[PDB]
């Protein structure tokens, strides 16, 4: 009963992560797609398929800043997380809906930030885990070699650890980034804990599936 969502030259991954090339509605009956501008930073999108089906038809859809960029991250650098793999108008950039956190000075203190769903609907939260190419990269970016990441809620629980290795160069990158996503129930808290390697949510999406 509603017009479709046209993603033009983008696919769903690039649109929803906010690939700078990918620039609205609150409702659509299906998504029209093409598969090139998706994840400009190479890596894997975990359970990508379920996210497509989950996004195919929606009745309510609002982007909101789950973690304000200038207010959420006092102990870390929220400015340096840009790359040539993700360019925006001739400049190095990054997903609009994520922030690549990076050490401040020469230490990466523990990160612990939470959010409680005060929207009256399911909230879609995305994030990434960065996987550096060398153990030297791991230190320059994150300081800590034993970096870990935990993400929890009432329905989601998972600890992440970086796998350091030399991949073949994709978009000149030897490192990799994995992308995750989960749904946060209307009364639910989501917690983030990290000693590095965490690509942080900035925008998330309040929604209703059809």
């Amino acid at each position, epitope marked *: 009963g509603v017009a479709p969502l046209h993603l033009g030259k983008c696919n769903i991954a690039g649109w929803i992560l906010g690939n700078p090339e990918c620039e609205t509605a609150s409702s659509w009956s299906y998504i029209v797609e093409t598969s090139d501008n998706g994840t400009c930073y190479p890596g894997d999108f975990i359970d990508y398929e379920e996210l497509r089906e989950q996004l195919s038809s929606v009745s309510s859809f609002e982007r909101f800043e789950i973690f304000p960029k200038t207010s959420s991250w006092p102990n870390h650098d929220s400015n340096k997380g840009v790359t040539a793999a993700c360019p925006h108008a001739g400049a*190095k950039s990054f997903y609009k809906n994520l922030i690549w956190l990076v050490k401040k000075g020469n230490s990466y203190p523990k990160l612990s930030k939470s959010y409680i769903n005060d929207k009256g609907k399911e909230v879609l939260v995305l994030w990434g885990i960065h996987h550096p190419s060398t153990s030297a990269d791991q230190q320059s970016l994150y300081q800590n070699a034993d970096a870990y990441v935990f993400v929890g809620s009432s329905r989601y629980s998972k600890k992440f650890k970086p796998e350091i290795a030399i991949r073949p160069k994709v978009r000149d990158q030897e490192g990799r980034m994995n992308y995750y996503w989960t749904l946060v129930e209307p009364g639910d808290k989501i917690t983030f804990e990290a000693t590095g390697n965490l690509v942080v949510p900035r925008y998330a999406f309040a929604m209703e599936r059809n």
Partner: antibody, heavy 124, light 109 residues
Framework: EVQLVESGPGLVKPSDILSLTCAVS?????????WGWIRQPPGKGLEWIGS???????YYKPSLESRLGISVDTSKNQFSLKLSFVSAADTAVYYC?????????????????WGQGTLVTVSS | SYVLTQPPSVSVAPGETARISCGGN??????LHWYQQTPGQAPVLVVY???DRPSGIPERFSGSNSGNTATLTISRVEVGDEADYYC???????????FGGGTKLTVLG
């Protein structure tokens, strides 16, 4: 506090090998840095040559790669340059320099500590 | 190989502001570093990671990489600032460091 000093012959015949060593003092190469070479012909600009990590990984200027070797000797806290089959185009002041990894995500290096340099003339 | 282009020369009266540009295709996608070299000496790092200053470098030296030439800006120029200035990037597609051709700063008056 970290110092680097280049040494080796100041005169080399064409078709021979140019050899240099950089002795580092005040800091151990076996540490999170790359170590490399930049040269400057007299009165001209700087040209980067190559670099090495204590593990042995190297980066070479593509135009020179066929004639270049770089080695490291952690036990003496030094590294060395070998440039083969030289001609007059290789006459330059040679600098060694510590290569610092950019804090940005993408691979990038810059040179924060430099030796004073050594002149090598290639001539018959 | 990646090419960096600098103007050969900039002149400025003492106390005024000198600006040195560094052009390259999509240079905004690379990080830039800048070096100062005084007659007879080794180059000295003055700016790294586009816009950061090493310890000990006067606040007068700043760098930028917005628009699409990057720029070394030197405020309140002093005669002691006469030197050749070089920009430098790392090219990730070919795994090498590249320098611009250098700019000579002259102080007038």
């Amino acid at each position: 506090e970290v110092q680097l000093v280049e040494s080796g012959p100041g005169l080399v015949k064409p078709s021979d090998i140019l050899s240099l060593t950089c002795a580092v003092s005040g800091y151990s190469i076996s540490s999170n840095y790359y170590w490399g070479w930049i040269r400057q012909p007299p009165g001209k600009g700087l040209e980067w040559i190559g670099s090495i990590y204590h593990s042995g990984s190297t980066y070479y200027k593509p135009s020179l790669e066929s004639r270049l070797g770089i080695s490291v000797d952690t036990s003496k806290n030094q590294f060395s340059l070998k440039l083969s089959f030289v001609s007059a185009a290789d006459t330059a002041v040679y600098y060694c320099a510590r290569h610092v990894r950019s804090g940005y995500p993408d691979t990038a290096y810059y040179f924060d500590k430099w030796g004073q340099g050594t002149l090598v003339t290639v001539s018959s | 190989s990646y090419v960096l282009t600098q103007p050969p020369s900039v002149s400025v009266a003492p106390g005024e502001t000198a600006r040195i540009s560094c052009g390259g295709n999509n240079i905004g996608t690379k990080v830039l570093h800048w070096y100062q070299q005084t007659p007879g000496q080794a180059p000295v790092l003055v700016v790294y990671d586009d816009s950061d200053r090493p310890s000990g470098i006067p606040e007068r030296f700043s760098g930028s990489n917005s628009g699409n030439t990057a720029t070394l800006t030197i405020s309140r120029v002093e005669v002691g600032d006469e030197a050749d200035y070089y920009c430098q990037v790392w090219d990730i597609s070919t795994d090498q460091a590249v320098f611009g051709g250098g700019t000579k700063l002259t102080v007038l008056g």
